[PDB]
């Protein structure tokens, strides 16, 4: 089993919506 079950921070678990957000925001890659 994994170390922590309520893990929001994992790659393959996350769904289509903020996958698209991930694509955009990794393309952006900065904050002011």
């Amino acid at each position: 089993a994994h170390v922590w079950e309520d893990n929001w921070d994992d790659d393959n678990v996350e769904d289509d919506f903020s996958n698209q957000l991930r694509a955009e925001l990794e393309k952006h890659g900065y904050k002011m």
Partner: protein, 910 residues
């Protein structure tokens, strides 16, 4: 079209070239998985049997592989006797290759013909023919028929015993012949005869290559026919103790692992003791590792209670010494399994002398922490994750050692080389998620590691940044320091991805640090790229800002509280507008919008209630005393327009609680934490309802005391514990103040205001289903009446009946059983008179159980009414343990209703 594909593939079959014949033959399985129609399946299979009876042996191998691929459609075959007659009729050929291929196909047809005596006989004869390739094909065919039959199995066990004693055929063919005895789990006497045969086999052939397959078939036989598990275990322990072959001992390892994983409760105390003695007496680190893995699995299971069940000290028990010495052994994996055994036994059993074992286990635990922290190997990280599992399990099972283990993990956070830090950050996040004091105990050092991050890491900076920001929020569950968040912003603006800082922001929204959340959402809002993304980030920003305003609250000041409520409600209004802007036909934020709307309505109800609480003193008792006599009040005992508004608020709050129950039962897809959180919000609403009902309204009729268990720390969140403590406080205060005053509500308004202030002082917890959603399950639910392509109503003669033929197919976005597995579908259909008792007579529901992911059900409706009717259906998906879970489309169909002219004329004559 399906028929068209069928006979064009038939023409490809009738083509001259065997290449094109192979083309069509291997093209059938696509047609099977496209058209599941059974007549088509039967005709295609019949043409297959024809071409297999007359093909040129490569077509035969192609047809064989087609059957072996599309095996699952075999059960819907009608003309079984003709199919089997062709396929069996080609077995009399003199070509050994053709005989072998045919026997393999019979092994494939085992699913539909398990009783064919002639097939049994042909397999048994070709089993002792001489042609090699058909001998091994006969072995494979026996291996399938013995799985799906019984009398064939007893025939084959007699024949196999005869052959093995009869000493013909070489050792390789003996290896092929042994694994037939796995399918002897049909009866106990067959199992015993095969067991005697296998014991004789191992004693007759002391060879490694013999013994390995013999033992593995013997143990699968016992694990299937679980009657001789103790004999199996003691035989394996004998061979692990006695036989000096290292490979055979590794077989014993990988087999006792299987038995320990399958049937743990059958493990006995003498078995455990014998394995422990073997693990002490072994010289080899690898075999000791395997035995320790076996003991780790058994310790995780129930059998530790068997080993420490009395009717010999626990210290006198040989397990403890082995566990201690192997936990302090030099080798890393051995130490990992030792600390696994120690953690399991410590959490499981509670005897008086085990405190020394607790101390030894925790100290050897930071030994594993330092070793895996500065090892940096893949196996080292595996043992590290094992140690962190030991941490989570030990701390949750026993809260006694929590502060010690947290401070040790912080010392390792000092002493780590920036690879294991993410892992132990997750682990200590879990531990502080259980017990809150672990963060505000040592806020400083985690911030020090945070400031050394930037020049400490170069490869997984994003990952460790996200983890340590999560735990800094968990540590500063209280109001976050401006200097600390400025340092956080400094490092994030130094080096971060937008997706990274977004994940820090999401963790901030999860824990409740809404000021930091507001800042991060503001930055991400100012960048974004796309429109629904912008509106989504903007809505999140507004809820974070409103929650910041709500946390900006002062105790026992009602005017400032309602001002803060109004400000926060303005900001939720902006946020919910932007959320409706973010809403799209794809990925529709239904749960998010509905949940934030219910939170809005809860806060509006709170503001209205505290407004009426303040207006309690607006001469309502004077209005009552002016309208009627104060003594023996006609409207109520100490009557009040304020009491009327209390009744209105009570009914409104109960309706709000009903809406929360509706939201939860329509959601159904979230995990345990989110569903629990929604239950707590409904708990708060019902708490306010019961408080205003049992204190302002009739307390003698209330007569309710919370004479039940409450306040246990079995919760899954510190947030949940905080709301639960608030609930206990409100219950004790209302139970104290139930009978003290008259209904004039002197300090009753003060008690209600205190409850409101506490319930708003506990901030919020934005949650996972409000964020990333998983196990997206749906019901298509296509009805099939007379097809109404437009909204034109469907005419029925109204004298006979009407049939519906509803159909549903269930779909899953991922692994369907993440949290809840669908079990049954309660469909619910009712009628309504479209032209205005609302046609609520037919109130049908039916519990169809989807055996496969498609289902259909026939409904009959009776009606004799002139007007149009609307027909409504519901899915009512009910899960494994049994819950309502109202999801589904809830579609509606219009139906017309006309009558016979002869019937109308007869009614006119009537």
């Amino acid at each position: 079209d399906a028929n068209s594909a069928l006979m064009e593939l038939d023409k490809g079959l009738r083509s001259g070239k065997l290449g094109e014949q192979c083309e069509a033959v291997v093209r059938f399985p696509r047609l099977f998985q496209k058209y599941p129609f059974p007549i088509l399946i039967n005709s295609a299979f019949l043409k297959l049997a024809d071409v297999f009876r007359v093909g040129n042996n490569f077509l035969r191998l192609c047809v064989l592989k087609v059957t072996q691929q599309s095996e699952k459609h075999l059960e819907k075959i009608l003309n079984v006797d003709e199919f089997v007659k062709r396929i069996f009729s080609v077995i009399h050929s003199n070509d050994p290759v053709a005989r072998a291929i045919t026997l393999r196909m019979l092994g494939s047809l085992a699913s539909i013909i398990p009783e064919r005596k002639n097939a049994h006989h042909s397999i048994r004869q070709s089993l002792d023919s001489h042609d090699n390739v058909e001998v091994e094909a006969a072995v494979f065919a026996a291996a399938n028929f013995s799985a799906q039959s019984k009398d064939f199995a007893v025939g084959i066990c007699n024949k196999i015993s005869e052959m093995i004693q009869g000493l013909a055929t070489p050792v390789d063919l003996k290896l092929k012949l042994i694994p037939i005895l796995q399918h002897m789990h049909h009866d106990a006497i067959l199992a015993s005869s095969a067991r005697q045969l296998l014991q004789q086999l191992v004693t007759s052939y002391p060879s490694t290559k013999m013994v390995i397959v013999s033992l593995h078939t013997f143990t699968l036989l016992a694990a299937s026919s679980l009657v001789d598990t103790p004999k199996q275990i003691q035989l394996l322990l004998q061979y692990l103790k006695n036989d000096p072959r290292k490979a055979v001992k590794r077989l014993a390892i990988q087999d006792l692992k299987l038995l320990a994983n399958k049937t743990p409760h059958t493990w006995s105390r003498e078995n455990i003791q014998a394995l422990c003695e073997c693990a002490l007496q072994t010289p080899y680190d690898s075999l000791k590792l395997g035995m320790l893995s076996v003991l780790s699995t058994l310790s995780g299971t129930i059998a530790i209670k068997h080993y420490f069940s009395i009717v010999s000290s626990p210290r006198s028990s040989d397990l403890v010494k082995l566990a201690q010495e192997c936990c302090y052994h030099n080798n890393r994996g051995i130490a990992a399994h030792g600390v696994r055994v120690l953690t399991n036994i410590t959490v499981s059993c509670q005897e008086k002398d085990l405190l020394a074992l607790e101390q030894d286990a925790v100290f050897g635990l930071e030994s594993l922490l330092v070793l895996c922290s500065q090892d940096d190997s893949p196996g080292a990280q595996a043992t590290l994750k094992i140690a962190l599992n030991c941490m989570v399990k030990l701390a949750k099972g026993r809260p006694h050692l929590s502060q010690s283990v947290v401070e040790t993990l912080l010392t390792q956070l000092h002493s780590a080389q920036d690879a294991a830090r993410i892992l132990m950050c997750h682990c200590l996040a879990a531990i502080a998620m259980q017990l809150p004091v672990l963060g505000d105990g040592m806020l400083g050092d985690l911030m020090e590691l945070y400031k050394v991050i930037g020049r400490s890491a170069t490869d997984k900076q994003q990952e460790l940044l996200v983890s340590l920001a999560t735990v800094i929020f968990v540590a500063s569950q209280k109001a976050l320091s401006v200097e600390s968040k400025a340092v956080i912003k400094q490092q994030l603006e130094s080096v971060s991805n937008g997706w990274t800082v977004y994940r820090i922001a999401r963790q901030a929204s999860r824990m409740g640090n809404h000021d930091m959340a507001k800042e991060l959402y503001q930055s991400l809002l100012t960048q974004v790229a796309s429109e629904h993304f912008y509106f989504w980030l903007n809505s999140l920003k507004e809820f974070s800002h409103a929650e910041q305003c709500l946390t900006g609250l002062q105790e026992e000041n009602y005017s400032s509280a309602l001002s803060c409520i109004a400000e926060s409600l303005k900001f939720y209004h902006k946020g919910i507008a932007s959320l409706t802007a973010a809403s799209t036909p794809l990925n529709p934020l239904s749960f998010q919008c509905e949940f934030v709307k219910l939170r809005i309505d809860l806060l509006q109800a709170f503001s209205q209630l505290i407004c009426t609480c303040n207006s309690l003193k607006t001469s309502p008792p004077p209005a009552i005393a002016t309208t009627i006599a104060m003594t023996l009040g006609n409207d109520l005992q100490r009557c009040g327009r304020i009491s009327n508004q209390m009744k209105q608020s009570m009914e409104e709050f109960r309706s709000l609680a009903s809406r929360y129950g509706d939201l939860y039962q329509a959601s159904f897809d979230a995990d345990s934490a989110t569903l629990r959180n929604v239950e707590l919000q409904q708990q708060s609403c019902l708490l306010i309802s019961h408080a205003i009902e049992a204190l302002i309204l009739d307390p003698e009729s209330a007569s309710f005391q919370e004479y039940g268990s409450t306040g246990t720390a079995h919760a899954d969140s510190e947030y949940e514990r905080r709301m639960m403590s608030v609930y206990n406080h409100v219950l004790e205060e209302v139970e104290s103040l139930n009978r003290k005053y008259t209904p004039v509500s002197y300090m009753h308004t003060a008690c209600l205001c205190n409850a409101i202030i506490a319930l708003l002082k506990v901030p919020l917890s934005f949650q996972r289903y409000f964020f990333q959603k998983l196990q997206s399950t749906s019901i298509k639910l296509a009805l099939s009446p007379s097809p109404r392509n437009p909204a034109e109503p469907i005419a029925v003669q109204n004298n006979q009946q009407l049939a519906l033929k509803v159909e549903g197919v269930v779909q899953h976005g991922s692994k369907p059983g993440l949290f809840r597995k669908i079990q049954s579908v309660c469909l619910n259909v009712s009628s309504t008179l479209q032209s205005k008792i609302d046609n609520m007579t037919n109130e049908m529901e039916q519990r169809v159980e989807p055996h496969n992911d498609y289902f259909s059900t026939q409904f009959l409706l009776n009606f004799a009414i002139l007007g149009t009717h609307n027909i409504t259906v519901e899915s009512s998906v009910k899960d494994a343990n049994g819950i309502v879970w109202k999801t589904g489309p809830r579609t509606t169909i219009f139906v017309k209703s006309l009558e016979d002219p002869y019937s109308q004329q007869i009614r006119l004559q009537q």
